[PDB]
Amino acid sequence: GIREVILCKDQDGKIGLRLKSVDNGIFVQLVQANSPASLVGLRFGDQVLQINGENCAGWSSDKAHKVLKQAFGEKITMTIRDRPFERTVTMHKDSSGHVGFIFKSGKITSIVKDSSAARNGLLTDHHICEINGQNVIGLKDAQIADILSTAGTVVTITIMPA
Numbered sequence: 001g002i003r004e005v006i007l008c009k010d011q012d013g014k015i016g017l018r019l020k021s022v023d024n025g026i027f028v029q030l031v032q033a034n035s036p037a038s039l040v041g042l043r044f045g046d047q048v049l050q051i052n053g054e055n056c057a058g059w060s061s062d063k064a065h066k067v068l069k070q071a072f073g074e075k076i077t078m079t080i081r082d083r084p085f086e087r088t089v090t091m092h093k094d095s096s097g098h099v100g101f102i103f104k105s106g107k108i109t110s111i112v113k114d115s116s117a118a119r120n121g122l123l124t125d126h127h128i129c130e131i132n133g134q135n136v137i138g139l140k141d142a143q144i145a146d147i148l149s150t151a152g153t154v155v156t157i158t159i160m161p162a
């Protein structure tokens with residue numbers, strides 16, 4: 001759904017957030033660790049409907065960057081729609097412990113024939129966002145692989161088109 005967040009700027013008047021224009025909307029592209037943006041729970045793929053009550057519709061990435069930098073006040077408010085491009089696909093590890101996909105730089109690149117990923121219709125050219133709800137955006141591939149490997153039999157992956 002939609003919600004309001006209220007962020008307090010840090011030491012340098014920053015919130016740790018980079019935004020990106022997509023289809024005449026504005027979306028969260030990068031959230032800094034331990035930042036005000038992380039504190040209020042902003043995540044890669046969240047949609048920003050308003051900043052300080054002003055509609056973001058049609059803003060360029062540069063204009064959103066400017067609005068954030070030049071915002072007057074110690075606080076910045078936003079209206080957020082939670083990751084509208086996100087979907088889950090649930091798969092099951094086979095007897096060798098595999099769900100059946102290859103990924104590189106956090107993006108699914110190949111589906112293994114006659115695997116659980118194949119049976120459940122996992123797609124390529126998609127970001128791996130969460131594994132059973134655990135956020136893996138920005139992790140190294142070996143870290144993603146480790147989280148996958150230690151998951152139980154049910155593996156639900158949250159994905160987003162890349």
Ligand SMILES: O=C1CC=NC(C[C@H](NC(=O)OCC2c3ccccc3-c3ccccc32)C(=O)O)=N1
Nearest residue numbers: 096097098099100101102103104112115144145148
């Ligand atoms: O790109 C990555 C990197 C790390 N993890 C994953 C997810 C994992 N994929 C995977 O480990 O493939 C190699 C695996 C393997 C190793 C040795 C011999 C046979 C087979 C075999 C046969 C069928 C399907 C998968 C496999 C998974 O599908 O659970 N993808």
